[PDB]
Amino acid sequence: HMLSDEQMQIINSLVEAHHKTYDDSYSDFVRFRPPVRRLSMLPHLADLVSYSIQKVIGFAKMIPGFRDLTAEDQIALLKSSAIEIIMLRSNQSFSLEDMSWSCGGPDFKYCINDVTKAGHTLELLEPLVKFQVGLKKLKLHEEEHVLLMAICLLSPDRPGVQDHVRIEALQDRLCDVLQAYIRIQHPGGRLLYAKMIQKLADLRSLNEEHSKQYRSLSFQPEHSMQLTPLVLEVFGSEV
Amino acid sequence: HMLSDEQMQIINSLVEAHHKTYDDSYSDFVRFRPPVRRLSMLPHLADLVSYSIQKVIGFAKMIPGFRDLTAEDQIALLKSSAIEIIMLRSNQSFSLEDMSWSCGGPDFKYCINDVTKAGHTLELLEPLVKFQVGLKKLKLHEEEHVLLMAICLLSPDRPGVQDHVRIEALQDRLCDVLQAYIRIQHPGGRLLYAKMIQKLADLRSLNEEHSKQYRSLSFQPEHSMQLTPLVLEVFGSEV
C-alpha cells in the first residue's frame, strides 16, 4: 500500500510550514530581554514563549483546512493548544546529554533551575522533562513530529470550539496521514502510532499544570507586568 | 527672607526621591529589549518608557502629601501626567551638543531618527526637541528640576481627579517652595519662575500630541503587541 496525492501534499505542506516557523539557529533569541540567573528568568522566558506563540500561529495558518474554520474556532483552538504545541516544538532543542533545552550558548541553554526562576514549580517541571525525554527517545522523523503538532492543535476536545464536526474531520484526516506514513516509511514501530497518541494525553496534563501556575502568576501584578501582551491574551480567559 | 523648616524637608524629600529613582549611568538599559536601526526601535523604546513609568511612580510616592490622596487620585494623577514627567526627567540625558538623548554609548544614544523608528511623527518630535533645548538652556539647579516635576504631577487640571481642593493645595505648597527657593538661592532669574510655569503649558501640548499618536498605535494590534502591560495600562483609557 501507499499514500495518496492528497496525503502527500498534506505532508509537504506541514513540513514546509514547520521549516518556515522554526529556526534551528535560535538567532532571534538575541532580541529577547536577556536572561538573568525573585523570578529573574521570567522576562526572558516570557519573551521566548511570546515569540513561540507567533510561530505556532504561523504553523497553524498553514495546516491544510485550518484556514477554513471560522475565526472563532481558529482562536479557540489556538488559545487552548498553544502551550502544548510549544512544549512539542521545544523537543527539537531538548538534549538528552544534559536534560536542558540548548538553544545556543550558555545564555540560551535553559536548564531546570531556570524554569523555576521563571516562577514555575517542580509540579510542572517534573512531568515536563519526563515528557521531553519520553518524546526524545521516540526518535521521530520530521514528518511524524510535524503531523503530531497538527493533530494536537486540531483536537476537538478544546474549550470554545463550535464546529465539533469540521475540526474533528480535519484531525482524523491528519491521523489517517500519520497512520499511513508510519505504515509505509517507518518499520521498528507497530505501536509508534499508539505511543504518540499517548503523548497527546501527556500534554493535556502538562497543559493543566502550566495553566494553573500561570493563573497564579497573572494575578500577581508585579509578575503579570513582566509578561507580553500576546502571552496575556493567549493564556488569559477572554472567551 | 528664608525658607521654613517645612519647605526645607520638602526640598530634602524631593531631591532624595529623585536620586533614588534616577540612575545617571543608565545601567539597567542593558535589560531592555535591544535597539534596532517597519518600527524597529519600538520594542526598545517601549521598554524604556515602561521602565521610566516605574521610576516616576516611585518619585510620586515620595512627594510629601501624595501618599495621602486616595488611591483613585494617585492613579488619576499618574495616568495623565506620566508622559510629561518622563519628558521632564529625560532632560537630564539630553545633550545640546548633538540634540540627542545620550544614555550611554552608541546603543543608548537616541537621536531623532530613532524616535521616528518607534512610530512617532515629526509633529511630536519637532516641539519635543524644542522643549528639550528650551528646558536645557534654563540651567536649572537640581532642586528646581525636581520641584518642577512634582508641580507637574500635582496639576489639579487632570482628567479623573476628585479632590480638586486637596491636590490643588499640595501643588500650591510646592509652588510656594519653588518661588521661595528661586528668591533665596537663584539670582540672574527674576522671570525664572514664570519661564518654568511656561514649560508646564508646553508639556500639556506635547502630552496631547503623544497621546494622539499612541492611540493610533495602540489600535494597530501588530504594534500594541510590542508594548508592555504597564505602558498599555498607563496610556490606555481605563477610568
Partner: peptide, 9 residues
C-alpha cells in the same frame, strides 16, 4: 482577542 485575531490575518 485583538492581537490573536490580527495575527491570523
Amino acid at each position: 482577542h485583538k492581537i490573536l485575531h490580527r495575527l491570523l490575518q
